[PDB]
């Protein structure tokens, strides 16, 4: 990898905003699943615009989610970078 945590943040940019690239980041950082809340709490931004970014990337394929049902369904996000290789 090495030049893939960038060849990733680059393919993103040239495709979506930058508002988005910020999200993909925290993900690439933590290195384990995250949830709009998290990506929103430890960043500081409306969880709404956070989820807005996620679905935009998701649509392109820079992230994948999993909703797993303590009452309440939950979606977890991860960076599809390994798939990039």
Approach to solving: X-ray
27 contacts 39 by C-beta, under 8 angstroms: yes
CA distance 64 to 2: 21
- Long-range CB contacts (within 8 A, 24+) of 52-56: 53/17, 53/19, 53/20, 53/22, 53/23, 54/23, 56/16, 56/17, 56/20
CATH, domain 1-85, list 3.40.710.10, 1.10.10.10, 3.30.2020.30, 3.40.50.150: 1.10.10.10
């Amino acid at each position: 990898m090495v030049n893939a945590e960038d060849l990733f943040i680059n393919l993103a940019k040239s495709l979506l905003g930058d508002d988005v690239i910020d999200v993909l980041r925290i993900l690439l950082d933590k290195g384990t699943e995250m949830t709009d809340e998290e990506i929103a709490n430890q960043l500081n931004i409306k969880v709404n615009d956070v989820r807005k970014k996620l679905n935009l990337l998701e649509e392109q394929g820079f992230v994948s989610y999993r909703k797993t049902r303590s009452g309440w369904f939950i979606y977890y996000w991860k960076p599809n970078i390994d798939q990039i290789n």
